[PDB]
Design a protein around this ligand. Structure first.
Ligand code: CD
Ligand code: CD
Ligand code: CD
Length: 31
């Protein structure tokens, strides 16, 4: 489940950015 900034805004392209706004692969980050 994506945070309050990943829905229409998954700005994570690599875990280097994903691990910066999130803590894990929301329902949209990498898999
Ligand atoms: Cd997120
Ligand atoms: Cd993320
Ligand atoms: Cd995401």
């Amino acid at each position: 489940s994506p945070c309050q900034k990943c829905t229409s805004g998954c700005k994570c392209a690599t875990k280097e950015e994903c691990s910066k706004t999130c803590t894990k692969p929301c329902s949209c980050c990498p898999k």
